[PDB]
Design a protein around this nucleic acid. Structure first.
Ligand SMILES: [Mg+2]
Ligand SMILES: [Mg+2]
Ligand SMILES: [Mg+2]
Ligand SMILES: [Mg+2]
Ligand SMILES: [Mg+2]
Ligand SMILES: [Mg+2]
Ligand SMILES: [Mg+2]
Ligand SMILES: [Mg+2]
Ligand SMILES: [Mg+2]
Ligand SMILES: [Mg+2]
Ligand SMILES: [Mg+2]
Ligand SMILES: [Mg+2]
Ligand SMILES: [Mg+2]
Ligand SMILES: [Mg+2]
Ligand SMILES: [Mg+2]
Ligand SMILES: [Mg+2]
Ligand SMILES: [Mg+2]
Ligand SMILES: [Mg+2]
Ligand SMILES: [Mg+2]
Ligand SMILES: [Mg+2]
Ligand SMILES: [Mg+2]
Ligand SMILES: [Mg+2]
Ligand SMILES: [Mg+2]
Ligand SMILES: [Mg+2]
Ligand SMILES: [Mg+2]
Ligand SMILES: [Mg+2]
Ligand SMILES: [Mg+2]
Ligand SMILES: [Mg+2]
Ligand SMILES: [Mg+2]
Ligand SMILES: [Mg+2]
Ligand SMILES: [Mg+2]
Ligand SMILES: [Mg+2]
Ligand SMILES: [Mg+2]
Ligand SMILES: [Mg+2]
Ligand SMILES: [Mg+2]
Ligand SMILES: [Mg+2]
Ligand SMILES: [Mg+2]
Ligand SMILES: [Mg+2]
Ligand SMILES: [Mg+2]
Ligand SMILES: [Mg+2]
Ligand SMILES: [Mg+2]
Ligand SMILES: [Zn+2]
Lengths: 120, 53, 51, 138, 89
RNA sequence: CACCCCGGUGGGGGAUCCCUCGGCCUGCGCGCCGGGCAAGGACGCGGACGCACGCGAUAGACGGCACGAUCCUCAGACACGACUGCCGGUCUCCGACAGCGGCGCAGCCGCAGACAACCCCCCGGACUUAAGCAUAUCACUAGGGGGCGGAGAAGAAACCAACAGGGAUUCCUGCAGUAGCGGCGAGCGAACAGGGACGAGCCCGCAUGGCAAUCGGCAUCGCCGAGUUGUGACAGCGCACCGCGAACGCCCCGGACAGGGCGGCCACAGAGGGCGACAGCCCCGUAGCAGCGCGCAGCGGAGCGAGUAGCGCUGCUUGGUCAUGCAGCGCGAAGCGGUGGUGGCGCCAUCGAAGGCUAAAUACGCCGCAGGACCGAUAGCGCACAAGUACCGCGAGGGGACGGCGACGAGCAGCCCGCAGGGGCGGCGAAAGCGUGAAACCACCGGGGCGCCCACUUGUGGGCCCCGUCUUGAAACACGGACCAAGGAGUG
RNA sequence: GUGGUAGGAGGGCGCGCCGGCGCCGCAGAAGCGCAUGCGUGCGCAUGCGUGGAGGCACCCGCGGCGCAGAUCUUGGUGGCAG
């Protein structure tokens, strides 16, 4: 947690792409020092994890950006649709299940639900 | 044979009831044991080994 | 046998790096009930099925 | 009796829940009673023990000793109090592990936001006592 | 002849690594795995009642299924970043 | 001297007992896979990392939120959030294509693969029972193939009935081990009722003709397409959902109090677990306490089902009997037809097939949860342990064994000897030193010499062949038995 | 009055657990070893040693309830055999 997420929200998506490449370089210099010399035990750990932290903030900013790009799209990208289940994505909608023929509409309209109470 | 009904004071007799005829029934100790044996195995839950075991 | 496919050598390398004792710092960990690696494999006694 | 069917009275599941408790639950299970001087201020019965807590030992060999908590270890459930020690052979003094139930907190540490956590339990206890007072009023 | 002498000639290896199931059961001549039946599309009908216990579903990592159990438990709310964006509009 | 027997000490081994983060069973809940790349696999990923488990090049905690001080073997990390929890990201590669299919289709989609308990469709045994056996039985099972779903299938009468008539399906009870089938042998074997659970009903087709009023797609209010070989209709949903929870002191014993004794206290809490012995009051807990909203609009209604029904033949099936069902083939309908335990014909009675949908009651494994007159490490799952692991098999596959110090605070290496393993004096601890430590067996020591029964003055006499078993008959030159522990067979 | 195979019957002993009921246990439970006693017998009780946390008796109820054998099963160990 050497690189904090608070600073990564300020950077842009392509600015996080360059940061992950720059942090990958420093990890290669750390893996050099681990082989040749000693290192503090979690230096490779920390630099590996803030590469992941930069890339996560990159992904989280990119999901937010791509959603507002293709929000009012006819077909949104599959990334931005909710991954329910293949069966649940192929389910009929509640509007489609409520679809009934004209005779069922007229009958429910002409004979609606009654609210009543009985007593003997 | 009349029984007292006590208050929560525990000493004052409030009513004096007659004994109900249930409590004057001569006890058949064998019959209460025979019924207790079958009543005890009303909540008897099953046990078995696994059929593959 | 000095001629092998890419899959054979990767499986042979994975069998080789696996075949090592418990690192000695693990014997000082609490709750470490393992004293020696019981899954050690010797090349003459135990065969690998890498064909 | 326990009338909640969804909680276990099972010994096996309660014992497994104790030894495979996670670290958040193991902190709660390592609670310790307060003194009466702390309970007049805070009100709650006990609180989870922490490092730098002043503690009087209530049971065991060190019973009646006072000292600060210098080490809590959640796995194996042991609180190590300053001035509750035993020597090794090489003269090295080791703190002796005491269960948290055998310790009573004399002075609560309040440094690392713990005064917030004490006041959160204190206020929720005070608020829940107000609801039970109104319900018994009605 | 029949026994100890004939075992010296057993230096062919007929069943090699299957690319689908990873057992050493893919035959070279037959070009079919004896365990899982690759390259048939459906899995081979397992030859024993215990073979499902060794090789079936749940005996592996269940990488997608453990995720979809966790999403189903929470109500399939899905991606946490996109969840707040659909909630705002 | 050896040998044998008995005891003591020490071995040997792991029985017993006590324990149990495990199993088993029952109930309930859930019932959610997949080109958005599944199941499964391969290969990689930890600072020191083999196994296990976790994970995917964002590779041994990446983000958000909650939590709030430790994690630990070393080194280190940590309020700029340790350890955690919940959810989400990332999620290599092999493994679902000679792909197949839908839609005018700039293109957009679907199918495949997994799951195999439950359910639906097809295929379909034999052992077995009949004291043989062939039909029968096992069994319309096992098994194989295909296919779904959270249930499925079924389902709104071409039904039951013969009454004073009932009224979808499914399930329960019951009819009923009955009618009946059956080398009428073995055996098999339903239905209507009556009672109940649960309840629910609907639709397409022959829709206007003063104009397809209908739909799909798009780069969208306009094109293009479908379509007259005929398109056409909205009543149901959603959110919220806590944190706190009462009450104990002294004395004794002890390594330690939860024990004993005395005295209290709380209880809508005396369920259970932890804590150095057995705790209502030490801890975790336990009893106890909290809801709501938003919706429903219109325009046809007599439409009707053919290579079918039925008949004939055949094969299968069924309790179904001069045919119950199903199929194939031949024949092939009607305006009235079907049916009436099932020969034909006639009556009378009762329904309307050959098109479609339909909740609930019903079934069920994994998994989650909760229980139990279950089992307690040779038991219980194969697995309480690095178990579908080690290991074996070319392969399909096969498949074990192994639990326990203590207050997880101490439990060491001081001195002498030995190259060393170690030994001896010591050391820690209440003790054990990975609980208890039976027997077989063994070492040494001590005592004694029938293998047993009887008798007594204990070494003599008298009596005794090896048990089990089958057998007319066993000491048998009948068979099984080296020893010991544990397990081990009339149950449901 | 007194034998007894196959066999039937009765009454008890013993084991795991149950509903009760009397109790016991760190001042030492079960288990185990050796003794003594009781008992026709199944078996029971005690003493001492060990052990270190549970157990006993009786009445009830449930039963996977009693072993010398099965070329029994599993484990251990002998003789053979230095
Ligand atoms: Mg080679
Ligand atoms: Mg070899
Ligand atoms: Mg050859
Ligand atoms: Mg060949
Ligand atoms: Mg001896
Ligand atoms: Mg054993
Ligand atoms: Mg279950
Ligand atoms: Mg994937
Ligand atoms: Mg993180
Ligand atoms: Mg399929
Ligand atoms: Mg059979
Ligand atoms: Mg026969
Ligand atoms: Mg026979
Ligand atoms: Mg025969
Ligand atoms: Mg499904
Ligand atoms: Mg259906
Ligand atoms: Mg039959
Ligand atoms: Mg129409
Ligand atoms: Mg409390
Ligand atoms: Mg026909
Ligand atoms: Mg008619
Ligand atoms: Mg009739
Ligand atoms: Mg119809
Ligand atoms: Mg044992
Ligand atoms: Mg076992
Ligand atoms: Mg062989
Ligand atoms: Mg021992
Ligand atoms: Mg005879
Ligand atoms: Mg003879
Ligand atoms: Mg004999
Ligand atoms: Mg002879
Ligand atoms: Mg023999
Ligand atoms: Mg036995
Ligand atoms: Mg006699
Ligand atoms: Mg007899
Ligand atoms: Mg007993
Ligand atoms: Mg007894
Ligand atoms: Mg038995
Ligand atoms: Mg025996
Ligand atoms: Mg015998
Ligand atoms: Mg031998
Ligand atoms: Zn394969």
């Amino acid at each position: 947690m050497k690189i904090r997420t608070l600073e990564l929200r300020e950077k842009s998506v392509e600015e996080l792409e360059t940061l992950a490449f720059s942090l990958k370089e420093e990890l290669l210099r750390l893996r050099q020092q681990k082989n040749t010399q000693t290192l503090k035990p979690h230096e490779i750990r920390v630099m590996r994890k803030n590469i992941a932290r930069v890339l996560t903030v990159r992904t989280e900013k990119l999901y937010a950006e791509m959603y507002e790009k293709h929000k009012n799209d006819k077909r949104m990208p599959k990334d931005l649709r909710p991954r329910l289940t293949k069966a649940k994505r192929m389910a009929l909608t509640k509007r489609q299940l409520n679809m009934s023929v004209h005779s069922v509409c007229k009958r429910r309209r002409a004979y609606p639900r009654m609210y009543f109470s009985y007593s003997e | 044979d009349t029984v007292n009904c006590y208050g929560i004071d525990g000493e004052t007799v409030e009513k004096q009831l007659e004994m109900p005829d249930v409590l004057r029934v001569p006890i058949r100790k064998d019959l209460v044991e025979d019924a207790f044996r079958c009543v005890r195995m009303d909540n008897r839950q099953p046990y078995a080994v696994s059929p593959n075991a | 046998g000095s001629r092998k496919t890419e899959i054979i050598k990767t499986r042979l390398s994975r069998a080789l790096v696996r075949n090592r004792p418990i690192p000695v710092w693990k014997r000082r960990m609490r709750g470490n009930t393992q004293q020696y690696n019981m899954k050690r494999r010797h090349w003459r006694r135990n065969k690998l099925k890498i064909y | 009796m326990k009338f909640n069917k969804e909680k276990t009275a099972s010994r096996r599941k309660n014992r497994k829940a104790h030894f495979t408790a996670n670290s958040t639950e193991r902190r709660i299970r390592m609670s310790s009673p307060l003194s009466k001087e702390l309970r007049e201020k805070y009100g709650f019965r006990s609180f989870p023990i922490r490092r730098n807590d002043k503690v009087v030992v209530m049971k065991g060999r060190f019973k009646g000793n006072t000292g600060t908590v210098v080490e809590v270890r959640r796995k194996m459930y042991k609180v190590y109090v300053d001035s509750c020690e035993a020597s090794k052979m090489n003269g090295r003094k080791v703190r002796v592990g005491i269960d948290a139930s055998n310790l009573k907190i004399i002075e609560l540490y309040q440094g690392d936001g713990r005064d917030k956590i004490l006041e959160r339990k204190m206020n929720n206890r005070r608020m829940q006592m107000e609801r039970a007072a109104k319900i018994k009023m009605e | 002849s029949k026994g100890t002498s004939s075992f010296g000639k057993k230096n062919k290896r007929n069943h090699i690594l299957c690319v689908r199931c990873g057992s050493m059961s893919y035959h070279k001549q037959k070009l079919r795995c004896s365990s899982c039946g690759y390259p048939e599309k459906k899995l081979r009908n397992r030859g024993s009642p215990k073979a499902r216990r060794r090789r079936g579903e749940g005996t592996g990592r269940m990488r997608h299924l453990k995720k979809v159990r966790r999403a189903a438990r929470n109500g399939f709310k899905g991606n946490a970043i996109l969840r707040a964006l659909r909630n705002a509009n």
